[PDB]
Write a protein that binds this ligand. Sequence first.
Ligand SMILES: *[C@@H]1O[C@H](CO)[C@@H](O[C@@H]2O[C@H](CO)[C@@H](O[C@@H]3O[C@H](CO[C@H]4O[C@H](CO)[C@@H](O)[C@H](O)[C@@H]4O)[C@@H](O)[C@H](O[C@H]4O[C@H](CO)[C@@H](O)[C@H](O)[C@@H]4O)[C@@H]3O)[C@H](O)[C@H]2NC(C)=O)[C@H](O)[C@H]1NC(C)=O
Ligand SMILES: *[C@@H]1O[C@H](CO)[C@@H](O[C@@H]2O[C@H](CO)[C@@H](O[C@@H]3O[C@H](CO)[C@@H](O)[C@H](O)[C@@H]3O)[C@H](O)[C@H]2NC(C)=O)[C@H](O)[C@H]1NC(C)=O
Ligand SMILES: *[C@@H]1O[C@H](CO)[C@@H](O[C@@H]2O[C@H](CO)[C@@H](O)[C@H](O)[C@H]2NC(C)=O)[C@H](O)[C@H]1NC(C)=O
Ligand SMILES: *[C@@H]1O[C@H](CO)[C@@H](O[C@@H]2O[C@H](CO)[C@@H](O)[C@H](O)[C@H]2NC(C)=O)[C@H](O)[C@H]1NC(C)=O
Ligand SMILES: *[C@@H]1O[C@H](CO)[C@@H](O[C@@H]2O[C@H](CO)[C@@H](O)[C@H](O)[C@H]2NC(C)=O)[C@H](O)[C@H]1NC(C)=O
Ligand SMILES: *[C@@H]1O[C@H](CO)[C@@H](O[C@@H]2O[C@H](CO)[C@@H](O)[C@H](O)[C@H]2NC(C)=O)[C@H](O)[C@H]1NC(C)=O
Ligand SMILES: *[C@@H]1O[C@H](CO)[C@@H](O[C@@H]2O[C@H](CO)[C@@H](O)[C@H](O)[C@H]2NC(C)=O)[C@H](O)[C@H]1NC(C)=O
Ligand SMILES: *[C@@H]1O[C@H](CO)[C@@H](O[C@@H]2O[C@H](CO)[C@@H](O)[C@H](O)[C@H]2NC(C)=O)[C@H](O)[C@H]1NC(C)=O
Ligand SMILES: *[C@@H]1O[C@H](CO)[C@@H](O[C@@H]2O[C@H](CO)[C@@H](O)[C@H](O)[C@H]2NC(C)=O)[C@H](O)[C@H]1NC(C)=O
Ligand SMILES: *[C@@H]1O[C@H](CO)[C@@H](O[C@@H]2O[C@H](CO)[C@@H](O)[C@H](O)[C@H]2NC(C)=O)[C@H](O)[C@H]1NC(C)=O
Ligand SMILES: *[C@@H]1O[C@H](CO)[C@@H](O[C@@H]2O[C@H](CO)[C@@H](O)[C@H](O)[C@H]2NC(C)=O)[C@H](O)[C@H]1NC(C)=O
Ligand SMILES: *[C@@H]1O[C@H](CO)[C@@H](O)[C@H](O)[C@H]1NC(C)=O
Ligand SMILES: *[C@@H]1O[C@H](CO)[C@@H](O)[C@H](O)[C@H]1NC(C)=O
Ligand SMILES: *[C@@H]1O[C@H](CO)[C@@H](O)[C@H](O)[C@H]1NC(C)=O
Ligand SMILES: *[C@@H]1O[C@H](CO)[C@@H](O)[C@H](O)[C@H]1NC(C)=O
Lengths: 132, 125, 125, 125, 103, 440
Amino acid sequence: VRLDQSGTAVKKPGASVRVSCRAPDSFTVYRPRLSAYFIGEFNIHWLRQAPGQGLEWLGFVNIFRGAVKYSSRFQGRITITRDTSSETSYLDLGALKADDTATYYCAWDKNVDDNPWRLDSWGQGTLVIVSS
Amino acid sequence: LGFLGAAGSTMGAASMTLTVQARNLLSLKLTVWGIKQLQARVLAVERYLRDQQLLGIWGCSGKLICCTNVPWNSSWSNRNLSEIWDNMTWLQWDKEISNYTQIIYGLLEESQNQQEKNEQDLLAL
Amino acid sequence: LGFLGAAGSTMGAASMTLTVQARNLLSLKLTVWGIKQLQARVLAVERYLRDQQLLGIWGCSGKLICCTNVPWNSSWSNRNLSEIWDNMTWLQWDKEISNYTQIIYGLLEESQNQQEKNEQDLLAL
Amino acid sequence: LGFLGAAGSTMGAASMTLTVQARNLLSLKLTVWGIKQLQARVLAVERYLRDQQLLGIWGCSGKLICCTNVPWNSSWSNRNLSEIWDNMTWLQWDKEISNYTQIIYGLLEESQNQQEKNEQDLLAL
Amino acid sequence: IQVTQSPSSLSASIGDTITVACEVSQDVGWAVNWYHQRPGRPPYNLIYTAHNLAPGVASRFRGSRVGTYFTLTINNLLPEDVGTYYCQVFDSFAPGGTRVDLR
Amino acid sequence: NLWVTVYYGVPVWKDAETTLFCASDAKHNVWATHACVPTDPNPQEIHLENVTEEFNMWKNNMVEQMHTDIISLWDQSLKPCVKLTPLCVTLQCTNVNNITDDMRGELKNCSFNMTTELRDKKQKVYSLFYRLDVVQINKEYRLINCNTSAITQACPKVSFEPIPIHYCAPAGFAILKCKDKKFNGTGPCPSVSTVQCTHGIKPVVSTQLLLNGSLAEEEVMIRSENITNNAKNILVQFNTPVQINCTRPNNNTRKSIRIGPGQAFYATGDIIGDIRQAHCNVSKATWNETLGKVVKQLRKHFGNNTIIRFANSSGGDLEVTTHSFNCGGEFFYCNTSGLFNSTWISNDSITLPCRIKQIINMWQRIGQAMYAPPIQGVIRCVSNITGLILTRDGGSTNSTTETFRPGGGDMRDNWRSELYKYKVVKIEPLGVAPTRCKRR
Ligand SMILES: *[C@@H]1O[C@H](CO)[C@@H](O[C@@H]2O[C@H](CO)[C@@H](O[C@@H]3O[C@H](CO[C@H]4O[C@H](CO)[C@@H](O)[C@H](O)[C@@H]4O)[C@@H](O)[C@H](O[C@H]4O[C@H](CO)[C@@H](O)[C@H](O)[C@@H]4O)[C@@H]3O)[C@H](O)[C@H]2NC(C)=O)[C@H](O)[C@H]1NC(C)=O
Ligand SMILES: *[C@@H]1O[C@H](CO)[C@@H](O[C@@H]2O[C@H](CO)[C@@H](O[C@@H]3O[C@H](CO)[C@@H](O)[C@H](O)[C@@H]3O)[C@H](O)[C@H]2NC(C)=O)[C@H](O)[C@H]1NC(C)=O
Ligand SMILES: *[C@@H]1O[C@H](CO)[C@@H](O[C@@H]2O[C@H](CO)[C@@H](O)[C@H](O)[C@H]2NC(C)=O)[C@H](O)[C@H]1NC(C)=O
Ligand SMILES: *[C@@H]1O[C@H](CO)[C@@H](O[C@@H]2O[C@H](CO)[C@@H](O)[C@H](O)[C@H]2NC(C)=O)[C@H](O)[C@H]1NC(C)=O
Ligand SMILES: *[C@@H]1O[C@H](CO)[C@@H](O[C@@H]2O[C@H](CO)[C@@H](O)[C@H](O)[C@H]2NC(C)=O)[C@H](O)[C@H]1NC(C)=O
Ligand SMILES: *[C@@H]1O[C@H](CO)[C@@H](O[C@@H]2O[C@H](CO)[C@@H](O)[C@H](O)[C@H]2NC(C)=O)[C@H](O)[C@H]1NC(C)=O
Ligand SMILES: *[C@@H]1O[C@H](CO)[C@@H](O[C@@H]2O[C@H](CO)[C@@H](O)[C@H](O)[C@H]2NC(C)=O)[C@H](O)[C@H]1NC(C)=O
Ligand SMILES: *[C@@H]1O[C@H](CO)[C@@H](O[C@@H]2O[C@H](CO)[C@@H](O)[C@H](O)[C@H]2NC(C)=O)[C@H](O)[C@H]1NC(C)=O
Ligand SMILES: *[C@@H]1O[C@H](CO)[C@@H](O[C@@H]2O[C@H](CO)[C@@H](O)[C@H](O)[C@H]2NC(C)=O)[C@H](O)[C@H]1NC(C)=O
Ligand SMILES: *[C@@H]1O[C@H](CO)[C@@H](O[C@@H]2O[C@H](CO)[C@@H](O)[C@H](O)[C@H]2NC(C)=O)[C@H](O)[C@H]1NC(C)=O
Ligand SMILES: *[C@@H]1O[C@H](CO)[C@@H](O[C@@H]2O[C@H](CO)[C@@H](O)[C@H](O)[C@H]2NC(C)=O)[C@H](O)[C@H]1NC(C)=O
Ligand SMILES: *[C@@H]1O[C@H](CO)[C@@H](O)[C@H](O)[C@H]1NC(C)=O
Ligand SMILES: *[C@@H]1O[C@H](CO)[C@@H](O)[C@H](O)[C@H]1NC(C)=O
Ligand SMILES: *[C@@H]1O[C@H](CO)[C@@H](O)[C@H](O)[C@H]1NC(C)=O
Ligand SMILES: *[C@@H]1O[C@H](CO)[C@@H](O)[C@H](O)[C@H]1NC(C)=O
């Protein structure tokens, strides 16, 4: 699936940043039994990578009902949501520090039982720079 | 061979491979495909049940080839046994005796009923 | 005669015309008529199969009338053979023994299983 | 006992009370419940009928226990008879034969057919 | 759930065979995924559940689990495979990763 | 010398999946119990012995099948009901009188110009709507679901109250029930008994607290698939029920509005008496004791010296953050922060605020949304509460304070608790065995 992502961003320390990841024509599945469209139970994961070191996991949003879950050491300053009408997912990171500057990826997870924590399609990556 | 393999063969050849083709007699929402499949399945089951009951009434249930006790009236076909068993195919033989088919079924049913009643009478003593 | 012809007749006639009234036990969109017809056909098939399985359990499959190995306890009925078979209709006998049917069915089932086991053990020689 | 009563028991106890579960193999608008129940009933009848097909092709129709005339090839299971019939329940036995069913099934039918043919050739004299 | 990866970096010439080791402090079963990131390029999955190939990846990568040890064999290396390999488990991710480059 | 023999009626089963039918014992209700075949008063449950069967609650097919079945029942039930397309019109909405501090702007007095009986003249008609059911553009408001999906109003006659349904496999199939009280989610169950129909299953609709569930026969039980996983929801099953009341103290009166030739739409008319917030009452002592039991049974999976902290929901849509459930015919979304606030370490009743929505789109379906009809009079619904849907938040390996929050959302996890001890088996009554016999 195509995962468009927002353009690069620059913010000041102590501000908030908003990153949007769009996955057109992928929020809905077919339930052939009822023969009706439903909202899929996919998980939109969010990953971050500082320049030089390996990736890190921020959170994920199950889009079926907007359920979320964040990493322990980011809790209290990151909010994750999705808009099913626009088929997009929004990451709102608040109170960025100097070390929070990095490239952020949105990842798509089919949430299949057989393969736990699998990301298939990745966004182009949005680089966010924080400084004064 | 397999299913219907020896259909055009002789009575002699075909009369020994009954099982290979008798075995294959039995092998969602309310959409068009679903209802068609369900109707087809129940129709196949009904046809097989009709045939099995027809076997059962003449006391041949569970027998591929059973012997009977009703004489073969030559009016149906006066051809020699060897001729019909060494040259024809089953389709031709069936076509020949198509119109003489209900009568033999009735004779078979009456003969089996009479034989069963006689057997019960004998088993009484 | 015909279907249910011997219904008013005594035992003697009815016990010889089983086949004539056993021959007719078995004889596309989602419209009300269509669904009613499909349910009716499935119901007929299910009833026939239930009866046939009950016959098969008692080891009498393929037979119109079969003899068994359990005796007739006088508790079920004390009426003698002669008037039973020359005096009353089948329906009257059924109404007379209807409330005793389950236990006798169980008796036949158990006896048939025991007889089959004994026959297998004897054949083991 | 009851349905599947001897499921965990050994071979001997199960082989004595087959009929308790043999007898329990068979027992409106177009809404969801209606179609679901209809499919369930048709599927149950079809499964029982396939079972009856396999039994009839082996010449054991109506018999809970029947014997055959083919050798038990040791390549399937070369284990002592007494330990098989006093140790392993039917489930474990199936789990140790499940790879080898189809072939033996075919053998059965073939033998049966051959036997029938031979029997017919004997009875023509 | 701690996850570590070895070696920190390695090098191999064209067409060789290499292995990368991932050690998980717990028995997480077969739920291991490996991800490859070319420099200046978002990473893409190549192996999931540690023994089943991802869509659209050449068959030269074959995974394997030996207890808590996880590794895959990379054969006949060609120079579009130079990059960074990370082994991810569950929520955790391997710090650093392994950098593979030609010599 | 040995010969094969077939054995009809052999007791051999295999794992299989097959459609099962409902059966309930006897007013129309949303579950078509009038179509279920009646169940026998005394099910012929049969105990077994010396038999061990592997159970996998998380790969069970029954749960998915029954979820699909419930979805179909819901869709077919609301299909032949009055449409509500004309309601998507401009609304003139004012703030509403005798209201406490918990209803500041919650209720909106909205008037529109719905057509009268004949489709030529407009009539000014007023009604009341809940603030979660309107969106601003006195001011102008529109129904919230007027730009994404159409609205259909459930017929007021049919009730949504759950009714127990028994699941019966078709002929030739059996349902294996595991009676092992200590049996966790996945594994062999030594004490397994066959049956023809499942026990009373109440298709309840809830997200955070498993209302009206089935209690475990021993100490509180925790179940999960790969409990190491964060994502996988952690099923809980209480031994002893935790009473809960969750009433609405208002006295709203229904009013009929003729929106077409015969199609009538029911609106919340005037409210007789004052207005008070809907609330849930839970006896604090019982909830505290239940939490103590659950943390005692939860320390086993992590260690005796670990720290367990109950935190409220992380966030998301209204149906997940708060405890959402049906009662009497009205949907409730109740703030659950009052419960999951404890920080367990090695008379009075708590009250949970609630809010009421009238557009319901559970099992999100792009194109349809139910308008819950108003219910006249006060509503009270005692509920037993049997299980929770907790999810372990992630944790850095340095610290050892696991935090549990009441997640959920998916109804499959909700329903896996009621079918946790059931499996479907296909009987294979054919078998072959060696024997000394040799058929003549
Ligand atoms: C978990 O399980 C519990 C079981 O205890 C459920 O509690 C039931 O909830 C329903 C839903 O409200 C209750 O049903 C209502 O009962 C009211 C009381 O009825 C009694 O009293 C009147 C006299 O006042 C008698 O006439 C009557 O026979 C009863 O003895 C009724 O007044 C309500 O009537 C409304 O609905 C009916 C149709 O059912 C309409 O005809 C009326 O006009 C009116 O609109 C209603 O019937 C029920 O009483 C509760 N208890 C029991 C034992 O069932 C929980 O709801 C359930 N929770 C979940 C989430 O599933
Ligand atoms: C929601 O708003 C509507 C519209 O205002 C309210 O209905 C209106 O209520 C008033 C109450 O004063 C009615 O006024 C009438 O006044 C005459 C005398 O002038 C009196 O005799 C009547 O008994 C009545 O009080 C008015 O007719 C009525 N309808 C309209 C169209 O205005 C409604 O009460 C409001 N509901 C809530 C909960 O606030
Ligand atoms: C389950 O296993 C036990 C033991 O393996 C069985 O107990 C046997 O019962 C019969 C019936 O009286 C005795 O003759 C045997 O001696 C018992 N076994 C032993 C080892 O003494 C039991 O029958 C099996 N089945 C059930 C349903 O419990
Ligand atoms: C966690 O999940 C993994 C896989 O999702 C389980 O590993 C087993 O993997 C094999 C692969 O062939 C499957 O056949 C088994 O069915 C899996 N086991 C189970 C119980 O499903 C692993 O067992 C799970 N549990 C733990 C504690 O790791
Ligand atoms: C349908 O209408 C709703 C209500 O206005 C829209 O949701 C709002 O969208 C704006 C767009 O910037 C947001 O700022 C608001 O926060 C949204 N409101 C809520 C309650 O989330 C929705 O986008 C509309 N959908 C379409 C397809 O037009
Ligand atoms: C549920 O109980 C079963 C019982 O067999 C557990 O399965 C094994 O249990 C033993 C000891 O209890 C462990 O050493 C194994 O690692 C378990 N195997 C697997 C595949 O889990 C099972 O772990 C229990 N599950 C839960 C969630 O408690
Ligand atoms: C809730 O409102 C209803 C509807 O009015 C009340 O039921 C009747 O109310 C009228 C006046 O509105 C009284 O004259 C009747 O006597 C009431 N019927 C009774 C009491 O059976 C109902 O009383 C109101 N609820 C409360 C708690 O006051
Ligand atoms: C839920 O508990 C609250 C606790 O305050 C109850 O509210 C009180 O109810 C009594 C009942 O007579 C009133 O006298 C009080 O004025 C109410 N408020 C306070 C602050 O005490 C409420 O009634 C309970 N509801 C249910 C359904 O149990
Ligand atoms: C929930 O409501 C029920 C019914 O109103 C309460 O149970 C009754 O409470 C009263 C008041 O103490 C007792 O006199 C009764 O004996 C209780 N039982 C019954 C059947 O009426 C229950 O206490 C409430 N739950 C709370 C407040 O947490
Ligand atoms: C969970 O609890 C937190 C605090 O314990 C709640 O956070 C408050 O949220 C409200 C509005 O949602 C804000 O006005 C407060 O400023 C927040 N306070 C803090 C300390 O965060 C949160 O709302 C609760 N969530 C739920 C679903 O109950
Ligand atoms: C749910 O209940 C919590 C209980 O704390 C509410 O949180 C408080 O909300 C009030 C607003 O009435 C604020 O003044 C407090 O600062 C909040 N405290 C905390 C610790 O968050 C919360 O607002 C309620 N509603 C939701 C949606 O969470
Ligand atoms: C077809 O005819 C040939 C001609 O002799 C014969 O040998 C053969 O058995 C017949 N049947 C088949 C199936 O070939
Ligand atoms: C009706 O009863 C009379 C009694 O005399 C009997 O002769 C006659 O055969 C009966 N009818 C039939 C059709 O058997
Ligand atoms: C609950 O019980 C524990 C001990 O069982 C006690 O320490 C605590 O004060 C009680 N109340 C709450 C709200 O935790
Ligand atoms: C709640 O649990 C108790 C426990 O005995 C039980 O008696 C009762 O029927 C259950 N349901 C209700 C509504 O109380």
